[PDB]
Design a protein around this ligand. Sequence first.
Ligand SMILES: C[C@@H]1C[C@H]2[C@@H]3CCC4=CC(=O)C=C[C@]4(C)[C@@]3(F)[C@@H](O)C[C@]2(C)[C@@]1(O)C(=O)CO
Lengths: 247, 9
Amino acid sequence: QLTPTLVSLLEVIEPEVLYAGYDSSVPDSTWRIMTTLNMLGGRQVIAAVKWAKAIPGFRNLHLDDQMTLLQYSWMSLMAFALGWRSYRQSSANLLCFAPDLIINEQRMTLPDMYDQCKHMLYVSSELHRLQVSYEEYLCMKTLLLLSSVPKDGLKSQELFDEIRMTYIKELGKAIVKRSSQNWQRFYQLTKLLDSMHEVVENLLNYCFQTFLDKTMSIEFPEMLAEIITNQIPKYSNGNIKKLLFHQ
Amino acid sequence: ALLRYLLDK
Ligand SMILES: C[C@@H]1C[C@H]2[C@@H]3CCC4=CC(=O)C=C[C@]4(C)[C@@]3(F)[C@@H](O)C[C@]2(C)[C@@]1(O)C(=O)CO
């Protein structure tokens, strides 16, 4: 394949699912779960960073750049992967957060549960609608890391773009495998990385209240603290840029 | 913060 593929790469650099560490037995509790996802979130995040530095060209960007990129698209990446996991078999749409923390028919019936899962289901249901191959998923996964930037680019913009494209190219080769009007297939996928922007949005709107109100009783690991705290009134000043494909 | 130590460690 003209030696190691940048694709067959991310595939091995792709992280390994974590366990919620949920108790189950004690009847389910809405926040008992949410608060259980969050703890888990921070780990995936952390695991994501390691996954990022592990990408070609990433370590190369100016650190402050690398530092904000993740800062933005952590949500976006957290949700895209999960969609995959649910899509992986959960025909009942079941939200699969961990190999031990899945959200079934009736777990979904819980208080203000479906009220937010509906968004996450969007993905998997969408991914399932486009039968995305693990290859394409990997490549898009990476491209979501670049879904949004400042408003004034980065100390390594030139680089950043340089890289980005190469993946937009790696994704092409990805779609290729399996021809004809491949160009439409490309379109559909491409319009879904843009969809994520709204997705990643509603999630923040729900995540910030819950992160704020202690009349909720939900807890976040420190990881997401620095990360949330920061990004909050921050991006809420239109100081960021949600990168698109189609306007 | 730690995000940076993790990033640059
Ligand atoms: C819907 C929002 C957004 C949610 C996150 C969406 C992305 C994600 C994917 C996973 O594979 C594991 C955990 C996380 C990282 C998450 F699921 C939890 O942290 C809980 C969360 C903040 C949320 O439920 C809350 O508002 C909790 O209060």
